Each structure stands twice: as C-alpha cells, then as structure tokens.
C-alpha cells in the first residue's frame, strides 16, 4: 500500500509495483522474473547497490515513494580473448 516502486531492468525497461512497507520483497522479485519469463536465479535485485534478500522489506531498506529497484543479471567469467 504505502509505496509505489519502479523496478528497472538493465535494458532500461520499467515495471511499476505498489507494495506494503513491511512485506518481504520475495513476492516482488518472483513476480518480476515470472513476468520476464526467466528463472529466479538468473537475476539480482539491487536497491542503490544493496543486494535485496527475500526477507528484506521496504522499511528495512529505507525506501521512499518513487524509489528504484535495479535488476542485474548473473555475471560469469573464466578468461579473456584476443580482441
């Protein structure tokens, strides 16, 4: 209820959520990824840099009306090439 958030993908696309201040963000994450057609484990939800756990709440993180949740994908690596 208490706040509207923007979840912004690293491709610049937005999904708006209305969420309760004391509710765990797990359902938000699972909605986003479900909506995106991708598995959960491929994604990483940051709020101003801080990794958002399944038991994090908007209140805990100090989020305000119109705040932004950024989505990042997994990063893997092993060696560099020629270029």
């Amino acid at each position: 209820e208490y706040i509207k958030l923007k979840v912004i993908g690293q491709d610049s696309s937005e999904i708006h959520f209305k969420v309760k201040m004391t509710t765990h963000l797990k359902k938000l994450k699972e909605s986003y990824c479900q909506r995106q057609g991708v598995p959960m484990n491929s994604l990483r939800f940051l709020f101003e840099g801080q990794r958002i756990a399944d038991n994090h709440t908007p209140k805990e993180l100090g989020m305000e009306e119109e705040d932004v949740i950024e989505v990042y994908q997994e990063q893997t690596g092993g060696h560099s090439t020629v270029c």
């Binding site: 990483r44 840099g49 756990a53 994090h56 997994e74 990063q75 690596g77 092993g78 060696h79």
Partner: protein
C-alpha cells in the same frame, strides 16, 4: 600456510557438488545466499559466478575487522561496470552509510563479460593497483577509480581529494601468478585479494587452483577463512 583438506572436509565438499535442488540454499550470511548452483561454479573448471565472488569478498571484509589486518571495504561485482557505463551519479548512493576513506583497502572486483580481474585501492600506499591473471593492462580502470575517489570525496565529505602521491598501475604478467587454463580467472581474483588483505606477498601459482576451489567450497559453507 596451505592448511590440509581433511577427510571430513572432502566428505562435505563432494556432498555439495552432488546432484540436488539447484536453488537449494547451502550457506547464508551478510544477508546473502549461496545455492547449489553457485557452489557448482567452483566444481571442476567451471566459471565462477558473481555470487561466489561477492560472498567471498564479504568474508574478506569480515576478517578485516581483526587486529593486525588492514581494514577492507569491498564493492560488489556490479559496481565497476555501472560506474564505467553510466557515471558517478549512478553509483553515488551505493555508499550512503559507508565511508570509503575510513578503511585501508577498497576491493573492486571487475567483471569483463567473460573474464574477472581485480582493482585495489590502498590508501596506505597511495596507489590504485589493477590485477589481471591473464596479464592485460587496464590503466583506464585505475583512472576511473581515481576520478571516482575525487567525486566521492566531494559528495560525501565536501572537500577535494588530495591527488598528490598517487600511483595508478597494472601488475605486469611476471609480477603476479598467471592462469594457464580458460577458467580460473575468478579464483585468481579471490586469492589475489586474500593475500593482499592479509598484507602478505602473493605466494601461490596455477598449481594450487584445484586445491583452492575445493577449499573455497568449504570456507563458504562454514563462513570461515582458513
């Protein structure tokens, strides 16, 4: 030292490398989670993912609290890419509630699409050091981090960062152990950082990597560095 992997350590490691729920949480700390999927990237010569790296970096940070060790703040592995592609403005809020100028060492793990390197800011030595286990030079990363320090000082401390005495360099292929396979870049990054945060010379080679992978599985499971 190179402490031994014990019998029960082996039993525990082989255990989490097994088949199972890929999303099953196996270790939890720093309000982060490490799943069976994540652990698998330490298996054989699999490519380490961001979860392993960030988690380990956080363990280094925990350790750094002890007497006789330099204090450490480790940025997460998305930081540098975001600073580079968008500017300071996109990352300034990532350090509300952290004062980067009050620790000795900043660890900056760097993801380059298919490869891992490490940048380190050492306020004691006054230099920004880049480390590539494949021997590449990246002075632009160092410059970017200097520019970051300038801006972070204005924004968080309302004064100009003193640039006097700072050196920006990349470790040469022959000054740091190099990798010899197409997979261990993440492992070098982590172990480079392990030594550095203990203030001890880098004392390993590619030869120790399968030992380090197996060991890391354990140290992550028990959230203790050996």
């Amino acid at each position: 030292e190179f402490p031994e992997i014990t019998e029960e350590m082996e039993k525990e490691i082989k255990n989490v490398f097994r088949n199972g729920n890929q999303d099953e949480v196996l270790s939890e700390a720093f309000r982060l989670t490490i799943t069976r999927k994540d652990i698998q990237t330490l298996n054989h010569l699999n490519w380490l993912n961001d979860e392993i790296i960030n988690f380990y970096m956080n363990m280094l940070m925990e350790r750094s609290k002890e007497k006789g060790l330099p204090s450490v703040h480790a940025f997460n592995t998305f930081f540098f890419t975001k600073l580079k592609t968008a500017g300071y403005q996109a990352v300034k809020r990532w350090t509300k509630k952290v004062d980067v100028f009050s620790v000795d060492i900043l660890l900056v793990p760097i993801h380059l699409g298919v490869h891992w390197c490490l940048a380190v800011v050492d306020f004691r030595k006054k230099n920004i050091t880049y480390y590539d286990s494949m021997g590449g030079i990246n002075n632009e990363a160092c410059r970017i981090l200097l520019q970051y320090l300038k801006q972070e000082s204005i924004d968080k401390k309302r004064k100009e960062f003193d640039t006097n005495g700072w050196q920006l360099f990349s470790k040469k292929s022959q000054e740091i152990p190099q990798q010899m396979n197409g997979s261990d870049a993440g492992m070098f990054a982590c172990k480079y950082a392990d030594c550095i945060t203990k203030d001890r010379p880098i004392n390993f080679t590619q030869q120790h990597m399968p030992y380090f992978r197996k060991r890391m599985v354990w140290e992550i499971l028990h959230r203790k560095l050996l």
